[PDB]
Design a protein around this nucleic acid. Structure first.
Lengths: 259, 204, 118, 153
RNA sequence: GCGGGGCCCGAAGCAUUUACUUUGAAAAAAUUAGAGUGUUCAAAGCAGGCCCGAGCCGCCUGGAUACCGCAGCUAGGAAUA
RNA sequence: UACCUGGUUGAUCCUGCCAGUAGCAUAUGCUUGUCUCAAAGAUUAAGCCAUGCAUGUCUAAGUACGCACGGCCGGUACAGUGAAACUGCGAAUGGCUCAUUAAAUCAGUUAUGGUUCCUUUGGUCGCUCGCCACUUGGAUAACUGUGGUAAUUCUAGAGCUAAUACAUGCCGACGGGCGCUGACCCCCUUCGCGGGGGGGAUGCGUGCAUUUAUCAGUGGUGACUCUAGAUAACCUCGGGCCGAUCGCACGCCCCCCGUGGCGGCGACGACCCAUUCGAACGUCUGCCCUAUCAACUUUCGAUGGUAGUCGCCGUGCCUACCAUGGUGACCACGGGUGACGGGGAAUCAGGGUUCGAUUCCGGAGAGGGAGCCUGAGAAACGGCUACCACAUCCAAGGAAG
């Protein structure tokens, strides 16, 4: 109204947080940060709904104010910090080292990683430009910007950066044939190879994505996130491997494992 | 509380539209700066963002540009000679953006003499002893006499333009927005554009 | 109602006061308020007036121009203690600090010293 | 037949008119460099937007206006009002209660750039959109295509 | 697009224009429609389930899916008007 | 459940309504043993309101020269704990109500290539050639001590004292490079000559940001007057950045030399760039009843055109000078609404009918209109000024709503 809002109601929160309805009126309201907030996930509900190390909004605070929660190799001390996608959280005392990945039902999935794969993350670039005195810049998926990148990295290309150094390790170019992940829209969480990128002059470009089991689909270019060279992903995948099962296909594999 | 929004206009058909909220803060009051020639008074008004804009209450000099030989010097403002938007703003001598100004020639006379070594503004001579006889002669060397005698292609000025170097004052045009940035910059009239306005001053 | 410097009219008028004129300490920032203040010309319609000596002449009024109050809080920033004791240069500012004596009855008789600044 | 019919010197904001006039640059054969640009989405720039002599802030080819947004189409219905025409775009509106349509319309004022000659009453004109140019004129004319002409006695 | 040849097809013109139809995006939850689950039952709620032989650093699993008009944006169709 | 039943007549077949019947939602009537969820001053009065309350806030880390306390660990800067006050930051959220508002809001959609954005993150923060820097200047609160008022979070005078408050201002990097200039090159064609070069003596300017002009055409987009490069110059005194700040563990070189040089992790601020949270203005299509409302809008902006003025930016948003336009029976314009819009709700064969003040999203407004201050963000009302309306205290001088 008269300025920016800093509350959030519980039913207006994104449903892939999977919040309750009757435990309160309000929602966690993730702070301003690297990721946009409908897309993202805050640190509060991660350790009391998704990991159950805490029970209140007070208990998530007094683990975090003991200064060992390492988002992307940095200790972030506010409990409504927006986490986001392809980031490594690090407990560093009991050492789980999660990476935040969408599962095949559209939700952030609890997913461990080995403590030497935890050293890096991947980021789609959204803009490359020349900065002052004729030097290059790029800006990434998160708010990290990079000076002097490898000049083969075009727009909406995927880079790999390591934490604790911060310069780009590997770039992996958006080309047909590569193995992408969709992070937005009705198809998100599914993992498949890129078929083609069909252009639109001025409008939105859509791509078609063939999965590894014939079910091709399509989302527009702004949702596509390449994480593989040809067919092998550079990161560990969650269970299901980004294959959306139908509801009869979800029925029988779930009601036969409970044999 | 003078506003700038669109809901007080009669709409495209010709119907009265009724006000649907109060007038807001982001249609902030718009008083005129009315920058005029004198000493230097600059006042600063904050805007949204906490930013500043320098409105110019009274101005003395400018930073006008020459272009054809690419010279820019500060120069003081003598007179306002013609305005396109309103013939009443020149009887009150007020600086606006597209007004034709009148400035002096003593930054442009001495740069052109210190670069080409031709007398300039002269019609009669026999007074040129103190700093004019020396600058074109200067006891040059060989190759410095070489590089200036080859500028006898690009020392010419069109006859409509040195006609106003003789009798003192050059008329130029403001390109800056005084009262918005607080400066009076711009460029000098020349060419087919100068034939335009010197008709529109003579026809007054 | 207190007087105000610069009215140049005897009587009582009403001024719109911002932060930093006189006679008005605001409650929140940016607040302006209209308040009645008395003019700077003095009249017979004053209940009290303040009155400060700039020159002592003949003799001692008892209880008024004698009995010096000790200025108990000395200089604290390390440029008004260097100016007070006429210290030339690097004269060990920590040494010539003034110290307040403390004389409660039920406690041991203390001394306190300040911090330093700059 | 001149261009300077205003009370201010009409010119293009980018090109510089003066080019070292002298015994090299004689006043007999004198052109000036014409700034034009090209609009995307495959729309041609007509000859009169290059070899013309006009001046317009609001021409999409030689002014400071940049088309991006919708592209529509209409019929030129009134060709008064210097440098801005009014076009009417008919359409059909559907009432699902009666399962039948409703022949509606709404007209719209668009900027006729003077790089078009044969714009007469009753043509087809495709129109793109851009920044606000006047109180009601939000669009700009891209491509005329004639109708009811080509031969007249 | 495997200055002049071959298993070769992209840019380009859409060479009347539309309506119509089909496809694909993108569409906030709650609610409704429904999947799951002895809240003891039910209306509801989104939880819960499983053996302790103690190693049980506790294990497994859910928190679906369908519906978002018309208007736009894509591709395909050309009878009908 | 795609459903009917009683009534005009002496009877009859009809048309047609009436009545019946079933929901659900306000109220009311009699009645009411137990337990799970649970609306609740919306309609009429967006009427009036006593009283009490709902926005405030210390870290190891801005300022303790209150004995309020401390072991006052000892002959001196401060063992800390700290009230109060200065500074900073919130108080622009939430809550409430539905009065206004009929292409307006709002909804889908699509833009900002026409702008701003505290923060959050991530960047940038020795690029500038120029007799305190081992630290510069002046005040002020809390405090002390006098007060004035019937009466308020009213405040006065004088004495003290601080800063991350309010201002000033430098060292180092700094050795120079470049460009514009410029007293010797004679080795070239001195043959009378014209010469072809590199070079110094010389004085200016030099980074980012702001402002204007011109030149060229690294990286971009469907598309620039984009980004980056180049040259001439600007830099507003109510003056752009280029750290005179505070914690913690303390270590290293010590050759000048036992006093001077080097260092780890922070916490703060800092122009600009992107990000995030946004906001604003635009495009498309969509809204109820009325012709006992058929022409409207333009002196007084109605539609456009040039030039501007301010505005954060586009634009009649204003102003001047010209053009005579724009909308309309495909319902303009005027009127009404018991009109906040929507997600929705009741209904239930299909098509529909009707409700939606009400927890979700958005908008509007705090008695009525209006004007501003601070601030990144308010034309704010548990902010201020004024009128109107209503109303409180007075010791009748004023005070506060």
């Amino acid at each position: 109204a008269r300025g920016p809002k800093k509350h959030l109601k519980r039913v207006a929160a994104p449903k892939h947080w999977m919040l309750d309805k009757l435990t309160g009126v309000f929602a966690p309201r993730p702070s301003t940060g690297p990721h946009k907030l409908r897309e993202c996930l805050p640190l509060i509900i991660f350790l009391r709904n998704r990991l159950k190390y805490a029970l209140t909004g007070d208990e998530v605070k007094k683990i975090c104010m003991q200064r060992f929660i390492k988002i992307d190799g940095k200790v972030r001390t506010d409990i409504t910090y927006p986490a986001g996608f392809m980031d490594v959280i690090s407990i560093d005392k009991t050492g789980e080292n999660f990476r935040l990945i969408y599962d095949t039902k559209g939700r952030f999935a609890v997913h461990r990683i080995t403590p030497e794969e935890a050293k890096y993350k991947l980021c789609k670039v959204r803009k490359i430009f020349v900065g002052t005195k004729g030097i290059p810049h790029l800006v990434t998926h998160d708010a990290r910007t990079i000076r002097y990148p490898d000049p083969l990295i075009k727009v909406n290309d995927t880079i790999q950066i390591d934490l604790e150094t911060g310069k780009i390790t590997d770039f992996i170019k958006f080309d047909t044939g590569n193995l992408c992940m969709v992070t937005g829209g009705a198809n998100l969480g599914r993992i498949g190879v890129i078929t083609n990128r069909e252009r639109h002059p001025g409008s939105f470009d859509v791509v078609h994505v063939k999965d590894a089991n014939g079910n091709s689909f399509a989302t527009r270019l702004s949702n596509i996130f390449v994480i593989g060279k040809g067919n092998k992903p550079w990161i560990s995948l969650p269970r299901g491997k980004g294959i959306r099962l139908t509801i009869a296909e979800e029925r029988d594999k779930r009601l036969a494992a409970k044999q | 509380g003078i506003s700038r929004d669109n809901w007080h206009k009669r709409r495209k058909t010709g119907g009265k539209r009724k006000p649907y909220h109060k007038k807001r803060k982001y249609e902030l009051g718009r008083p005129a700066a009315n920058t005029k020639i004198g000493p230097r008074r600059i006042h600063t008004v904050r805007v949204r963002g906490g930013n500043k804009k320098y409105r110019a209450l009274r101005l003395d000099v400018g930073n006008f540009s020459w272009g054809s030989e690419c010279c820019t010097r500060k120069t003081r403002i003598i007179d306002v000679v013609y305005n396109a938007s309103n013939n009443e703003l020149v009887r009150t001598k007020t600086l606006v953006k597209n007004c034709i100004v009148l400035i002096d020639s003593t930054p442009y006379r001495q740069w052109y003499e210190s670069h080409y070594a031709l007398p300039l503004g002269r019609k009669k001579g026999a007074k040129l002893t103190p700093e004019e006889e020396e600058i074109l002669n200067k006891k040059r060397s060989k190759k410095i006499q070489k590089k200036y005698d080859e500028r006898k292609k690009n020392a010419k000025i069109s006859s409509l333009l040195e006609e106003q170097f003789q009798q003192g004052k050059l008329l130029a045009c403001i390109a800056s927005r005084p009262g918005q940035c607080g400066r009076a910059d711009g460029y000098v009239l020349e060419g087919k554009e100068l034939e335009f306005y010197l008709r529109k001053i003579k026809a007054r | 109602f207190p007087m105000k410097q610069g009215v140049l009219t005897h009587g009582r008028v009403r001024l719109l006061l911002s932060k930093g004129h006189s006679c008005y300490r605001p409650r929140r920032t940016g607040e302006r308020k209209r308040k009645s203040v008395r003019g700077c010309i003095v009249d017979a319609n004053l209940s009290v007036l303040n009155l400060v000596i700039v020159k002592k002449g003949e003799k001692d009024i008892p209880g008024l121009t004698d009995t010096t109050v000790p200025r108990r809080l000395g200089p604290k920033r390390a440029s008004r203690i260097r100016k007070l004791f006429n210290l030339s240069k690097e004269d060990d500012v920590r040494q010539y600090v003034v110290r307040k004596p403390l004389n409660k009855e039920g406690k041991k008789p203390r001394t306190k010293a300040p911090k330093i600044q700059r | 037949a001149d261009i300077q019919t205003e009370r201010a010197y009409q010119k293009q904001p980018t090109i510089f008119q003066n080019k070292k006039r002298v015994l090299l640059g004689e006043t007999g054969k004198e052109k000036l460099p014409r700034y034009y640009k090209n609009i995307g989405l495959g729309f041609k720039t007509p000859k009169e937007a290059i070899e013309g002599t006009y001046i317009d802030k609001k021409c999409p080819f030689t002014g400071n206006v940049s088309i991006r947004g919708r592209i529509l189409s209409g019929v030129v219905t009134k060709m008064k009002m210097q440098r801005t025409i009014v076009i009417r775009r008919d359409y059909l509106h559907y009432i699902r209660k009666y399962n039948r349509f409703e022949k509606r319309h709404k007209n719209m004022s668009v900027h006729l750039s003077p790089c078009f000659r044969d714009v007469q009453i009753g043509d087809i004109v495709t129109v793109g959109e851009c920044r606000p140019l006047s109180k009601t004129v939000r669009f700009n004319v891209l491509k005329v295509t004639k109708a009811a002409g080509t031969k007249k006695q």
